Design a protein around this motif. Structure first.
Motif, PDB file in Angstrom:
ATOM      1  N   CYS D   5      44.703  47.783  56.404  1.00  0.00           N
ATOM      2  CA  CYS D   5      43.751  46.727  56.731  1.00  0.00           C
ATOM      3  C   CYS D   5      44.468  45.448  57.152  1.00  0.00           C
ATOM      4  O   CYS D   5      45.651  45.472  57.494  1.00  0.00           O
ATOM      5  CB  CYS D   5      42.832  46.447  55.540  1.00  0.00           C
ATOM      6  N   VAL D   6      43.746  44.334  57.125  1.00  0.00           N
ATOM      7  CA  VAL D   6      44.369  43.018  57.056  1.00  0.00           C
ATOM      8  C   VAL D   6      43.933  42.267  55.801  1.00  0.00           C
ATOM      9  O   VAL D   6      44.660  41.413  55.294  1.00  0.00           O
ATOM     10  CB  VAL D   6      44.033  42.167  58.294  1.00  0.00           C
ATOM     11  N   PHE D   7      42.744  42.593  55.306  1.00  0.00           N
ATOM     12  CA  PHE D   7      42.224  41.975  54.092  1.00  0.00           C
ATOM     13  C   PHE D   7      42.692  42.731  52.862  1.00  0.00           C
ATOM     14  O   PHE D   7      43.040  42.132  51.839  1.00  0.00           O
ATOM     15  CB  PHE D   7      40.702  41.942  54.155  1.00  0.00           C
ATOM     16  N   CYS D   8      42.701  44.059  52.948  1.00  0.00           N
ATOM     17  CA  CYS D   8      43.168  44.894  51.850  1.00  0.00           C
ATOM     18  C   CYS D   8      44.683  45.062  51.886  1.00  0.00           C
ATOM     19  O   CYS D   8      45.301  45.401  50.870  1.00  0.00           O
ATOM     20  CB  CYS D   8      42.457  46.256  51.888  1.00  0.00           C
ATOM     21  N   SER D   9      45.305  44.834  53.047  1.00  0.00           N
ATOM     22  CA  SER D   9      46.756  44.981  53.137  1.00  0.00           C
ATOM     23  C   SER D   9      47.463  43.640  52.982  1.00  0.00           C
ATOM     24  O   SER D   9      48.516  43.557  52.338  1.00  0.00           O
ATOM     25  CB  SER D   9      47.151  45.631  54.462  1.00  0.00           C
ATOM     26  N   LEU D  22      37.317  34.507  63.240  1.00  0.00           N
ATOM     27  CA  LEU D  22      37.598  35.774  62.570  1.00  0.00           C
ATOM     28  C   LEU D  22      36.505  36.799  62.834  1.00  0.00           C
ATOM     29  O   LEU D  22      36.783  37.994  62.961  1.00  0.00           O
ATOM     30  CB  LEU D  22      37.760  35.535  61.071  1.00  0.00           C
ATOM     31  N   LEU D  23      35.259  36.346  62.955  1.00  0.00           N
ATOM     32  CA  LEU D  23      34.172  37.272  63.242  1.00  0.00           C
ATOM     33  C   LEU D  23      34.179  37.688  64.706  1.00  0.00           C
ATOM     34  O   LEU D  23      33.683  38.764  65.055  1.00  0.00           O
ATOM     35  CB  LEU D  23      32.844  36.632  62.863  1.00  0.00           C
ATOM     36  N   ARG D  24      34.748  36.858  65.579  1.00  0.00           N
ATOM     37  CA  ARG D  24      34.836  37.231  66.986  1.00  0.00           C
ATOM     38  C   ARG D  24      36.094  38.055  67.251  1.00  0.00           C
ATOM     39  O   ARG D  24      36.263  38.608  68.342  1.00  0.00           O
ATOM     40  CB  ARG D  24      34.778  35.970  67.853  1.00  0.00           C
ATOM     41  N   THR D  25      36.972  38.190  66.256  1.00  0.00           N
ATOM     42  CA  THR D  25      38.048  39.165  66.392  1.00  0.00           C
ATOM     43  C   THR D  25      37.544  40.597  66.226  1.00  0.00           C
ATOM     44  O   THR D  25      38.225  41.546  66.629  1.00  0.00           O
ATOM     45  CB  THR D  25      39.162  38.888  65.384  1.00  0.00           C
ATOM     46  N   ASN D  41      39.351  48.923  58.961  1.00  0.00           N
ATOM     47  CA  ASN D  41      39.003  48.186  57.761  1.00  0.00           C
ATOM     48  C   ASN D  41      38.916  49.113  56.560  1.00  0.00           C
ATOM     49  O   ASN D  41      38.598  50.296  56.677  1.00  0.00           O
ATOM     50  CB  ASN D  41      37.666  47.464  57.926  1.00  0.00           C
ATOM     51  N   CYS D  42      39.225  48.559  55.396  1.00  0.00           N
ATOM     52  CA  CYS D  42      38.714  49.124  54.162  1.00  0.00           C
ATOM     53  C   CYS D  42      37.199  48.958  54.131  1.00  0.00           C
ATOM     54  O   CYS D  42      36.650  48.037  54.739  1.00  0.00           O
ATOM     55  CB  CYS D  42      39.411  48.474  52.963  1.00  0.00           C
ATOM     56  N   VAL D  43      36.522  49.880  53.438  1.00  0.00           N
ATOM     57  CA  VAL D  43      35.077  50.059  53.605  1.00  0.00           C
ATOM     58  C   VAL D  43      34.313  48.869  53.046  1.00  0.00           C
ATOM     59  O   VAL D  43      33.269  48.470  53.585  1.00  0.00           O
ATOM     60  CB  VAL D  43      34.639  51.369  52.933  1.00  0.00           C
ATOM     61  N   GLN D  44      34.833  48.280  51.963  1.00  0.00           N
ATOM     62  CA  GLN D  44      34.236  47.093  51.364  1.00  0.00           C
ATOM     63  C   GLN D  44      34.217  45.940  52.352  1.00  0.00           C
ATOM     64  O   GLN D  44      33.189  45.276  52.543  1.00  0.00           O
ATOM     65  CB  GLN D  44      35.039  46.692  50.133  1.00  0.00           C
ATOM     66  N   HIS D  45      35.338  45.720  53.029  1.00  0.00           N
ATOM     67  CA  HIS D  45      35.416  44.608  53.957  1.00  0.00           C
ATOM     68  C   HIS D  45      34.790  44.964  55.292  1.00  0.00           C
ATOM     69  O   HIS D  45      34.505  44.080  56.097  1.00  0.00           O
ATOM     70  CB  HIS D  45      36.864  44.174  54.111  1.00  0.00           C
ATOM     71  N   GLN D  46      34.559  46.247  55.548  1.00  0.00           N
ATOM     72  CA  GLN D  46      33.765  46.601  56.716  1.00  0.00           C
ATOM     73  C   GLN D  46      32.304  46.265  56.482  1.00  0.00           C
ATOM     74  O   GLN D  46      31.607  45.795  57.393  1.00  0.00           O
ATOM     75  CB  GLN D  46      33.945  48.077  57.051  1.00  0.00           C
TER      76      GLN D  46
END
Lengths: 100, 156, 117, 64, 32
Positions: D5-9, D22-25, D41-46
């Motif tokens: 991910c980027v949030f989980c990693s 970040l939302l337009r990325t 993504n990890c599913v939580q952050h998806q």
RNA sequence: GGGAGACUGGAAUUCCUGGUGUAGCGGUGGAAUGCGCAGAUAUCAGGAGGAACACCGGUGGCGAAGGCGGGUCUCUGGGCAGUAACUGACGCUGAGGAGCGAAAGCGUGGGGAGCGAACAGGAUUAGAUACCCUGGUAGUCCACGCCGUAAACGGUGGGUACUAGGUGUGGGUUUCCUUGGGAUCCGUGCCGUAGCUAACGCAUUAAGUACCCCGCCUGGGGAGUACGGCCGCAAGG
RNA sequence: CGCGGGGUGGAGCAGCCUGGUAGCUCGUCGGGCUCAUAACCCGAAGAUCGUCGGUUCAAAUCCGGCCCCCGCAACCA
């Protein structure tokens, strides 16, 4: 509607003439496209301690091209009935299938 | 010899008197059966009558009539789904020469001159000017092709 | 009549035909060209050749009011989008944009159910 | 993609419905939301990206 | 299994439903 | 996306008023009824109103099962892991019984855009009471109740202990390299031994090995029908 | 009673007010389409203006009647 009735190896009773006329006459009802019918009546199985297998063949030049149609049955009336059921469905298909 | 691919065709010798592929091919399409020699007498006599009514080389008159009957598009036949579609297709060179000579001979054969020589002479002349019925069959074939241009896409 | 310096095309490519209006930025349509108005009717109306003749006649009636530059707006599913764009770029109007504005509902009104033939 | 991910990693990052960069990325050029397979993504952050993009569309910060 | 069993059963069911359509009225009044 | 209540968001369809603007649009295997020429379809601006929530979103999550996906807020239900602080066998199942229970349908009152049984016309056809086309009422929606049925299907009652593994993915704890693997508890898929099976298959999420309680079956029709009773406004169960 | 308009391949429809250039739609056979049926598609076979009258280069075209056709709206006919 010209209707030729041949045997094959068989008597041709007045019941067979009339019944032939009326089943095949169903086809004169609704297929105006007809011309000649040729109808020929085989008789084997007979002579063998068993039941005779009749066979009916029917030829039909429509207005246009040539159907043929063949049926084997234990008796003759049931066979010619069955043969006319088949022919009626076919013809309306050769009536059918077209119309754009 | 269809369904195995294209089949090799016989090479055709040229004319002795006139020296053209197209004259001999006109002879072999004049040939109502049996009498190739009599077909040669019809074609030769008709082209010297064309020589009389032109005063020029007869094969130039023949190729100009052959050009003025020669079609470019032919219609056919593919029935997609319960409707018959006249589909226009590009015509090959040999197919176009065949339709030109075959229409020329047949619609010369419909024409009302006395012998066959005067028929074929008058049909090669009228197709050279552009006034035969065969040119009208070229215009009716392009009428069916241009009238049916839309169905041609199938790419078939 | 008037002059228009540049306009936008509208091509409605809905299976049985394509209706090609052109329109200024304002959106008013100077003229509208359709396959049916060419002379084709019925299933021949569906063909891409009908779209090419529709964009031809739309581009000639367009050119009578002096349009030169066009931004093309093509509608949803059908035969005759890039064919009508082709006949526009050949028939007197030039490329501009090719914008695929398909009207997308997002599970909106329920569509007609299923055609079993 | 095929990242983790980027949030989980990267293990510290907050997805914020005000933050329009970040939302337009993660939306497409159409504006539609990309997949979990496309962005990794990890599913939580998806789920939280999908809800956050959807909120940002609800307050006019994304072109719908 | 086969759908033949299912369809014999359903033929019975259908016939019965029809029989209650036509006798609906009659059952109400003959019963009341 | 467990449930309920409340407030609100945009795209799209339809109608409405007003522009721009003309002879076709619509529809099909091919057509015709149909809407147009009184200004349609097309395009632009504005307005109404209803319903469904593109993308995220799938072999994924949650719920006992039906089932649940726009957003936010309010109230509330369950699950999982970790520690082990407490209680000390309080467990399991459960005849009858009460409750929940898709869709269609029913009652009273609202709402009614799209779709649409019935119902028309058109077409196809020997003939269509059909498919296909054009229109179209109940219904679909909400409030309050009924009804109790489904291929309500994993076609597999609930609990428990054990029985080679391999690989995905969902939730959480920790040992090691230092996110990578390890081990662990709970979940959900694909392949696979032993064993089982009539065969297909199942195969640690058993249809394997055993124990506990319940439901149910006893050739096919007749028939889940009659008679009788119970529930239901009725359809019916 | 009138003043009007109203006639053009079998038909319906134009065109007929600004004379040279009468179209159009179903009743037309032959095709290509299918192994077929039909459609779909192409072409083909009929009027020079109900008709007759003057002028102008040219006259359905302009003007006089008629056969007609009516619209009606009038009729204390």
């Amino acid at each position: 509607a010209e209707v030729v009735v041949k045997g094959r190896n068989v008597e041709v009773p007045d019941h067979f003439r009339t019944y032939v006329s009326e089943k095949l006459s169903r086809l004169e009802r609704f297929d105006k496209t007809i011309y000649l019918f040729d109808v020929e009546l085989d008789h084997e199985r007979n002579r063998r301690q068993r039941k005779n297998c009749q066979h009916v063949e029917i030829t039909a030049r429509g207005r246009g091209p040539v159907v043929r149609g063949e049926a084997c049955a234990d008796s003759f009336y049931t066979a010619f009935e069955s043969a006319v059921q088949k022919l009626e469905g076919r013809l309306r298909r050769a009536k059918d299938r077209r119309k754009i | 010899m269809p369904r195995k691919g294209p089949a090799p065709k016989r090479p055709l010798v040229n004319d002795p008197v006139y020296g053209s592929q197209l004259v001999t091919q006109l002879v072999n399409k004049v040939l109502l059966e049996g009498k190739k020699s009599l077909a040669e007498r019809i074609v030769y006599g008709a082209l010297e009558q064309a020589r009389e009514k032109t005063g020029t080389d007869p094969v130039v008159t023949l190729k100009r009539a052959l050009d003025n009957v020669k079609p470019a598009l032919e219609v056919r036949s593919r029935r997609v789904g319960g409707a018959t579609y006249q589909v226009p297709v590009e015509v090959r060179p040999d197919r176009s020469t065949t339709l030109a000579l075959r229409w020329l001979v047949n619609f010369s054969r419909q024409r009302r001159e006395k012998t066959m020589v005067e028929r074929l002479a008058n049909e090669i002349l009228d197709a050279s000017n552009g006034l035969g019925a065969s040119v009208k069959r070229r215009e009716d074939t392009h009428k069916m092709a241009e009238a049916n241009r839309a169905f041609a896409h199938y790419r078939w | 009549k008037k002059n228009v310096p540049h306009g936008a095309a509208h091509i409605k490519s809905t299976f049985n035909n394509t209706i090609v209006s052109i329109t200024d930025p304002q959106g008013n349509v100077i003229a509208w060209a359709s396959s049916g108005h060419v002379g084709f009717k019925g299933s021949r109306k569906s063909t891409p050749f009908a779209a090419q003749l529709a964009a031809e006649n739309a581009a000639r009636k367009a050119q009578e009011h002096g349009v030169k530059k066009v931004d093309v707006f093509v509608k949803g599913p059908g035969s005759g989008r890039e064919t009508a764009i082709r006949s526009l770029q050949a028939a007197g109007l030039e490329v501009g944009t090719i914008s695929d504005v398909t009207p997308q509902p997002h599970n909106g009104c329920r569509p007609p159910k299923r055609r079993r033939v | 993609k095929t990242r983790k991910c980027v949030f989980c990693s990267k293990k510290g990052q907050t997805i914020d419905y005000k933050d329009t960069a970040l939302l337009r990325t993660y939306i497409s050029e159409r504006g539609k939301i990309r997949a979990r397979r496309v962005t990794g993504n990890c599913v939580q952050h998806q789920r939280d990206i999908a809800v956050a993009v959807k909120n940002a569309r609800e307050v006019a910060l994304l072109p719908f | 299994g086969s759908v033949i069993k299912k369809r014999r059963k359903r033929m019975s069911k259908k016939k019965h439903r029809k029989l209650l359509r036509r006798t609906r009225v009659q059952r109400r009044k003959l019963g009341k």
